DNA sequence: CGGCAGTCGCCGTCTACCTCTCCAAGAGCAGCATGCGC
DNA sequence: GCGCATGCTGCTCTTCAAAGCCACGGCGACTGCCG
RNA sequence: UCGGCAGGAGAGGUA
């Protein structure tokens, strides 16, 4: 919910997420960037890191 | 179409009484800051005169209730909370919109994450730095390509 | 569409004031088309992104 | 329709403007010719039920394959079309050629 | 010509001009002097069509009275607007921070019909602002100009659309009034006309014709020709007025009781009324015109009657029919046809008057309403004009118009070109027009009726293309709102001198000739064809025989500032359109000269822009210095004219007079007296002169670059000053008063030396960025209470002091509640050209100076004359702008100075040639006009005419070129190249201005980012479009620290800073605080967001541990 | 020698493809302009007006 | 804070009780702020009781001063001694009748 | 009852930078202050 | 000359009226409405 | 050691 509450219609969105009791993993690179993380990709992969 | 909506208040462990409210909660202060407008008042919050409503309502309903009003004034009253309410929530989606001075809208709290303007696409997609500049740039022949 | 009526001088000798006011019909029109060929163009890059 | 509003009516799957159907299953063809409306039905040369495509338009026009006969054949009634020819002249659609 | 002293500019013109170009500034003050009501107006008016001289505000205050109440006992009305004396001339408003104003007062009277005695008395009325002689109001001590508003004209309107469901042509109608309730009639799919009354769902046309009062038989009977009217008829079902009646009841007003009484008010009080309903005089008119009917009396009313409604329906069916004529019972004849939105004919002009009539009526209507509610609520006998009238909503109205209003603009005087063309804008925005977003394609095109009063070339490049334009020259507005332009009469093949102005809806009904045609000494045609225009805007080539007008001159379709450009028609559209635009950011320069070679309009938009200054009366000059002209008349009146001596404009730029009389020369009405800014002996001049040479010059000048030379800064050739104000406040405080002092606690003594006994610099010291300006402390309460607030430069300034103002409270001085004492400050400074700074040409060409040379490494000319700019030639053939080299050879052969030799006659390249341009000086001024200039047979033949230098020697050669040598190496360059001169300017795009940086500084509050622009040392945004290309190359921790360490993570930003600082190692980034807003925000909404744990165990995220 | 060797990054808007961002090593001029190489103008678009 | 402990984010419908359990305090009075004191008012939107002490280490009163009292509740203001950074983290509620 | 087609309302419409001005109003209600009369 | 009575302008406080007003494409629910 | 600040709307421009 949180990589597509910041692409369009977040207000239905965030009522369906609600309604669902949805869970987010924060494995993307929307999130990682919004959250303040490495993103998974070029130098912030495990096997560079 | 139905299922979609009954199915997802019995696999999970919550209740459908979550759409009906009994307490409204109140956001920090120096969220809705309150500045002077150059050593003059201070000119409107946006956000601490939905408030001010909301708590001017109850304030009233509260009183005629403990009171032994009539039926019609009390089922009036009732009614005025409910949309000062909802225009606190999400104001201009049923009816008009509340206005302030100069016929301009009053910005709810959910104009604060919707939009090219919100929080989302605003604040936290993107942001400004620190150690950065501008100039107008012209030609250099004299350089290397780094 | 077409005018059946040519400009029969080039920019080296210089239209007339009917033939260069003839001539801005389908120049405005380029720059305006341009100007709403960037708005369009630039949400498919953020769709597809 | 060329340009940018193709492009994103080819990303964003839409049906398109003039939708040209395609050819269910191969078999000939039953070209008639109407007032302003053709009316194909083709021929099953599986063995069942024609696949009715009628009603299509006069405007938007016939097309050309690479037809058995070895040429640009304008379907004539009698016409051996195989399963995915596009009959008519006209961007297809997406879903059904899914 | 045509004005008493004036410089000699010779002119390559053929053709002679039967007008004069009218006044530049008309339009702005025709519509205030008939607002007014002054006699001028009066005068003008009853010169011809003397019907009904009423003014702007009469006829405001004759719509309004008379008052009445519901008994109908009392009665209020006005009469006799008249004004008083300005308060204050217009410098004492501009310093002070006033209004240029004059008081309103009228009469009323007060009517009691129950007794039926009279009391009438003069009530004042608020203080009503005024436009001074040069278009501009005033308003709070700043200059403004209103815009004039292109809008649609109230009337009726048809179309036609073709379905794409079936497949047939549906038409409609929509009558459209000043103020009022929406008709839309329309035909249908099937055959059912039916009627939106007020875009209230839909509804059988034969409803409202039974609800009218026409029965069966009546309708039947005369709309019988067609079909779809006998359809409808047929299948309506409410035969009867009160049933009819109902039925629209039932629809306008739903869910209330229906009674006919109700319905019967309901269809008077909508369209057939008074109090809200109105067709204004122009809807009136245009009605009266479309559906051809009583256009043989006056023009009064202003409702819509039933023979308008009955007509309009005809006309749809005939037009459903299609056929093309029409006649109503007893009327006239008219075509059946559909129009167009964006005709100029159906396009009126909303000028300054009628936007302030607006308001003026809407404060009015406000005043009414409230005196007509406070009418019932007091007593009688003791009612009085002045206690039932309320002035506060018409000077609220008023203020709110001047302030807060996105027509009435701050005005740009960055040049005398950009404030004449500011006032002579048409606008197709504001409260009633368009929006940037909702306005298409098609409303930004050049209409085939714009000629001749629209602009097709100036207009902005950017998201307002197309929804601004420009007034032409020979244009001027109807008492309606349409522009009109005049043409010349032409009878039996010869052409008259008899001029005419004609609207766009009146010259399509005639073939006009064009300007650019061959005319005899009697005035017969040359060519056997010309080229005109007919009806819808068609070009053909008819036979000369035809023609029934003629246009005026070539120039009849440019504005002011695209008539400025020498060699028009070479240049492509875009690049003159760039050249237009160009033209009105130039700064004015210490020195002025005029152009080598200009187009003649110089002179005449510098005396209408109004920036020098002019006598008003013949007389000898007996005394001149640098701030005042005394004239002595003949009659015995001595009239002195002072100046305005390095005066700050709106933009920053210097407004300088200076005088260029003697002490004894004779001064003739009309002649220029004085020079302006950006003036040189009367003509407007931009720019300089400088010797140019095409070529490529080791990349230096690649892509848009130009080279410059060191004799353009040694010389100040390109030099402008800027001038800067600075202002502070001084107020009580509750734990005190803020005095300005020079005794400040809290700094030293060595920086408090340039400050005088009263706390402000003295005028003449050399201020630099940080110093201090005045000193000012604040008491903290009751010693050591003193904070120190003093004003200081900011950074990145510097400059000169040249004047302080000082305003107090007690020596009896105006000045806002709660302050004590102001101040302002000038600093002045002179800037030279640099890299980076912008330079601009009249054809389109622009670039930033690359290089600075010396005298010595730039290529010269065979006796040793270095080159002053360089400009490359890969840009010329691919952007279409020729004009540009033209102008350089016109430009060499007038500098230079030629003579044609006639031994043997006038050679044949040179017989239509004046014979005053036989031959001319060196250093000649020469003039193109636009569309009527030099030929290039003429600059081919004067470019092997020119004159020698002190040596007997020929430098440029048949084709305009010269063999140069090489500065940096001594060898001649192996081709020659093209040398002449051109007329380049400075434009106000200036790298001092642009440069910026930051490493720390001020944060925001709620979200502690970085603060945003250059005044406030902000930083940079990092947008999202520059996070996906930090995520497609790959860099992780590059994209980490710019987003956590660098904006949002406060505890990180200072570790950070210190690790910089000792050298150790940056640490590890932290959370940013946005996040844990939007989580905040996202909890104010009701919503239980938490962030769990690998085994659940919600974090608390609030630190504090 | 405090900027000798440390690389700054050089950004143009809009930013369509990855080549809008690049690396340099700056050097000290005089002026208030920044010098760019003639053959980065193709990869950032830029012209010189 | 580390942000390598984060492993879920969860959202849902909150009822009266975790309305009831994040507030600090319920709000009575519609007031603002003094225009003339220039300082909270009480129970108001802008208390300090609710949502925290507007200076570092201070409160409503003057009992106690400087960072030396912290933990103790002022027993006739009602407001923590404590920094004044808590006035971004600490929200109230309304009682709808 | 049952198709149904029009209708209406709600989503979306390129990035970075510079300069300027304007921000509720009215009505009641104070605690004094100045005129008139004996 | 003194005592009584009546109006200065800053300050404070609280919010519906009511006329004023007039893109475009896509999609999906839905709702009277005809049959 | 006292002491100490940064919201909205409209208009015009540059690439
Ligand atoms: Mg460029
Ligand atoms: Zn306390």
């Not at chain 5, 309460?781 to 003193?786: I, P, T």
Request: charged content about 30%; some cysteine; glycine content about 8%.
């Amino acid at each position: 919910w949180l990589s597509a509450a910041s692409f369009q219609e977040t207000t239905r969105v965030l009522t369906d997420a609600a309604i669902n009791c949805r869970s987010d993993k924060l494995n993307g690179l929307k999130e990682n960037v919004i959250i303040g993380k490495l993103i998974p990709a070029g130098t912030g992969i495990n096997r560079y890191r | 179409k139905r299922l979609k909506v009954v199915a997802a208040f019995q696999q999970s462990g919550n209740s459908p009484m979550g759409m009906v409210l009994d307490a409204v909660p109140v956001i920090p202060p120096e969220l809705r800051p309150m500045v002077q407008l150059d050593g003059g008042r201070f000119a409107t919050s946006d956000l601490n005169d939905l408030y001010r409503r909301v708590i001017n309502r109850n304030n009233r309903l509260k009183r005629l209730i403990d009171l032994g009003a009539p039926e019609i004034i009390v089922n009036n009253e009732k009614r005025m909370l409910q949309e000062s309410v909802d225009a606190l929530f999400d104001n201009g989606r049923r009816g008009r919109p509340v206005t302030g001075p100069g016929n301009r809208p009053l910005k709810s709290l959910s104009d604060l994450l919707k939009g090219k303007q919100g929080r989302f696409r605003q604040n936290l997609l993107g942001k400004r730095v620190d150690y950065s500049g501008r100039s107008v740039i012209v030609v250099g022949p004299q350089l290397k390509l780094h | 569409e077409f005018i059946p009526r040519p400009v029969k001088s080039s920019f080296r000798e210089g239209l007339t004031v009917l033939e260069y006011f003839i001539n801005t019909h389908g120049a405005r029109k380029g720059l305006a088309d341009t100007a709403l060929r960037t708005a369009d163009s630039g949400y498919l890059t953020r769709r597809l992104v | 329709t060329g340009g940018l509003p193709r492009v994103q009516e080819l990303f964003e799957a839409r049906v398109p403007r003039g939708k040209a159907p395609i050819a269910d299953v191969t078999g000939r063809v039953r070209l008639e010719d109407g007032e302003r409306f053709y009316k194909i039905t083709i021929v099953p040369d599986d063995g069942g039920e024609e696949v009715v495509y009628d009603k299509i338009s006069k405007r938007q026009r016939l097309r050309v394959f690479k037809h058995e006969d070895g040429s640009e054949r304008v379907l004539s009634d009698g016409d051996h079309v195989e399963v995915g020819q596009q009959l008519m002249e006209g961007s297809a659609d997406p879903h059904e050629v899914l | 010509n045509s004005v008493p002293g004036a410089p000699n500019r010779v002119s390559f013109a053929k053709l002679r001009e039967p007008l004069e170009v009218p006044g530049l500034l008309d339009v702005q003050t025709d519509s205030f002097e008939w607002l007014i009501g002054s006699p001028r107006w009066r005068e003008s008016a009853a010169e011809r069509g003397d019907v009904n001289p009423v003014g702007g505000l009469e006829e405001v205050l004759y719509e309004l009275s008379p008052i009445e109440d519901f008994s109908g006992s009392m009665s209020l009305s006005f009469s006799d607007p008249r004004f008083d004396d300005v308060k204050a001339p217009v410098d004492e408003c501009k310093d002070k921070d006033m209004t240029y104003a004059a008081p309103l007062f009228v009469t009323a009277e007060f009517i009691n019909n129950n007794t039926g005695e009279i009391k009438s008395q003069t009530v004042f009325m608020g203080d009503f602002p005024m436009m001074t002689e040069k278009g501009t109001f005033i308003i709070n001590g700043t200059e403004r100009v209103v815009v004039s508003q292109l809008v649609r004209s109230p009337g009726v309107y048809f179309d036609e659309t073709i379905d794409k469901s079936t497949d047939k042509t549906l038409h409609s109608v929509k009558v459209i009034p000043s103020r009022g309730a929406w008709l839309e009639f329309d035909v249908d799919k099937r055959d059912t006309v039916g009627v939106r009354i007020d875009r209230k769902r839909r509804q059988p046309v034969t409803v409202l014709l039974k609800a009218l009062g026409w029965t069966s038989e009546q309708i039947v009977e005369r709309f019988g020709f067609s079909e779809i009217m006998r359809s409808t008829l047929e299948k309506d079902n409410t035969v009867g007025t009160d049933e009819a009646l109902l039925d629209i009841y039932r629809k306008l007003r739903p869910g209330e009781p229906p009674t006919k009484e109700s319905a019967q008010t309901l269809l008077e009080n909508l369209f057939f009324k008074e109090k809200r309903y109105d067709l204004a005089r122009v809807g009136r008119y245009k009605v009266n015109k479309k559906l051809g009917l009583h256009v043989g009396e006056p023009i009064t009313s202003s409702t819509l009657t039933e023979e308008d409604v009955v007509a309009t329906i005809e006309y749809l069916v005939r037009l459903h029919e299609g056929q093309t004529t029409m006649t109503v019972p007893g009327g006239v004849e008219v075509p059946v046809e559909t129009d167009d939105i964006d005709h100029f004919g159906n396009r009126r002009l909303r000028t300054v008057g009628e936007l302030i009539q607006n308001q003026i009526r809407v404060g009015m209507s406000r005043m009414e309403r409230v005196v007509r509610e406070r009418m019932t609520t007091q007593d009688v006998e003791a009612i009085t004009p002045q206690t039932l009238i309320n002035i506060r909503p018409v000077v609220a109205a008023i203020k709110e118009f001047f302030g807060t209003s996105q027509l009435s603009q701050f005005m740009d005087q960055n040049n005398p070109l950009s404030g004449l063309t500011h006032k002579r804008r048409l606008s197709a925005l504001g409260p009633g027009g368009l929006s940037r977003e909702r306005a298409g394609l098609e409303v930004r095109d050049v209409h085939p009726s714009h000629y001749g009063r629209m602009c097709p070339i100036e207009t902005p490049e950017g998201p307002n293309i197309g929804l601004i334009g420009s007034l032409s020259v020979y244009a001027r507005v109807n008492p309606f709102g349409f522009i009109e332009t005049p043409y010349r009469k032409v009878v039996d093949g010869v052409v008259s001198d008899e001029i005419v102005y004609l609207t766009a809806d009146e010259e399509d009904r005639h073939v006009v000739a064009q300007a650019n045609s061959p005319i005899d000494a009697d005035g017969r045609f040359v060519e056997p064809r010309v080229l005109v225009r007919r009806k819808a805007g068609e070009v053909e080539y008819v036979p000369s025989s035809e023609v029934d007008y003629m246009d005026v001159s070539p120039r009849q379709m440019v504005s002011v500032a695209t008539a400025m450009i020498p060699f028009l028609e070479h240049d492509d559209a875009n690049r003159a359109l760039m050249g237009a635009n160009m033209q009105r950011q130039a700064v004015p320069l210490v020195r002025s000269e005029a152009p080598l070679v200009g187009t003649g309009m110089e002179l005449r938009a510098a005396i209408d822009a109004g920036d020098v200054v002019v006598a008003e009366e013949s007389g000898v000059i007996e005394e001149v210095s640098a701030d005042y002209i005394t004239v002595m008349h003949d009659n015995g009146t001595r009239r002195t004219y002072r100046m305005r001596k390095f005066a700050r404009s709106n933009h920053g730029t210097c407004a300088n007079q200076c005088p260029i009389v003697d002490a004894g020369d004779r001064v003739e009405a009309g002649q220029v007296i004085a020079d302006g800014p950006c003036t040189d002996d009367g003509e407007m001049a931009l720019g300089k002169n400088l010797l140019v040479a095409i070529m490529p010059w080791e990349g230096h000048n690649y892509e848009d670059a130009i080279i410059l030379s060191n004799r353009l800064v040694e010389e100040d050739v390109l030099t402008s000053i800027h001038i800067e104000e600075h202002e502070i406040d001084a107020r009580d405080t509750k734990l005190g008063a803020e005095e300005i002092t020079r005794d400040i606690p809290n700094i030293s003594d060595e920086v408090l030396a340039d400050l005088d006994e009263r706390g402000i610099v003295r005028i003449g010291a050399e201020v630099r960025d940080g110093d201090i300006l005045v000193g000012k402390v604040t008491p903290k309460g009751e010693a050591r209470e003193v904070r120190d607030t003093s004003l200081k430069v900011p950074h990145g300034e510097s400059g000169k002091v040249i004047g302080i103002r000082v305003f107090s409270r007690e020596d009896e001085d105006e000045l806002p509640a709660g302050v004590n004492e102001l101040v302002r400050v000038y600093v002045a400074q002179k800037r030279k050209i640099s890299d980076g700074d912008k330079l601009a040409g009249r054809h389109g060409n622009k670039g930033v100076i690359g290089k600075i040379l010396p005298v010595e490494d730039m290529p010269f000319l065979a006796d040793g004359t270095p080159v002053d700019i360089i400009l490359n030639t890969h840009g010329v053939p691919r952007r279409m702008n020729i004009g540009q080299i033209l102008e350089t050879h016109l430009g060499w052969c007038a500098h230079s100075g030629w003579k044609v030799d006639a031994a043997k006659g006038v050679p044949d390249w040179a017989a239509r040639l004046p014979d005053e341009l036989l031959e001319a000086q060196p250093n000649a001024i020469v003039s193109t006009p636009v569309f009527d200039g030099a030929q290039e047979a003429e600059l081919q033949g004067l470019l092997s005419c020119t004159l020698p230098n002190r040596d007997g020697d020929v430098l440029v050669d048949a084709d305009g070129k010269a063999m140069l040598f090489d500065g940096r190496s001594g060898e001649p360059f192996p081709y020659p190249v093209t040398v002449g001169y051109m007329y380049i300017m400075k434009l106000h795009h200036l790298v001092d201005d642009k440069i910026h940086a930051r490493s720390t500084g001020p944060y925001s509050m709620i979200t502690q980012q970085p603060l945003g622009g250059k005044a406030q040392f902000g930083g940079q945004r990092f947008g999202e479009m520059e996070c996906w290309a930090m995520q497609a190359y790959g860099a992780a921790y590059t994209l980490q620290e710019l987003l956590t360490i660098k904006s949002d993570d406060t505890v990180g930003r200072v570790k950070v800073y210190e690790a910089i600082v000792k050298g150790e190692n940056i640490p590890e980034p932290g959370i940013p605080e946005s996040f844990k807003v939007l989580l905040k925000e996202l909890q104010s909404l009701c919503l239980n967001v938490e962030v769990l744990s690998s085994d659940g165990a919600a974090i608390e995220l609030r630190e504090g541990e | 020698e405090v900027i000798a060797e440390h690389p700054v990054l050089l950004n143009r808007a809009p930013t369509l493809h990855r080549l809008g961002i690049q690396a340099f090593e700056p050097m000290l001029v005089e002026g208030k302009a920044i010098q760019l190489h003639p053959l980065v103008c193709e990869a950032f678009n830029a012209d010189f007006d | 804070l580390d942000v390598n402990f984060f492993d879920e984010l969860r959202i849902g419908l909150a009822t009266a009780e975790d309305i009831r359990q994040w507030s600090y305090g319920e709000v009575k009075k519609p007031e603002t702020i003094n225009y003339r004191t220039l300082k909270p008012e009480k129970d108001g939107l802008f208390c300090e009781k609710i949502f925290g002490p507007t200076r570092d280490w201070e409160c409503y009163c003057g009992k106690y001063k400087r960072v030396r009292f912290k933990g103790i509740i002022c027993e006739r203001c009602g407001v923590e001694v404590t920094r004044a950074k808590v006035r971004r983290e600490r929200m109230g509620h309304i009682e709808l009748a």
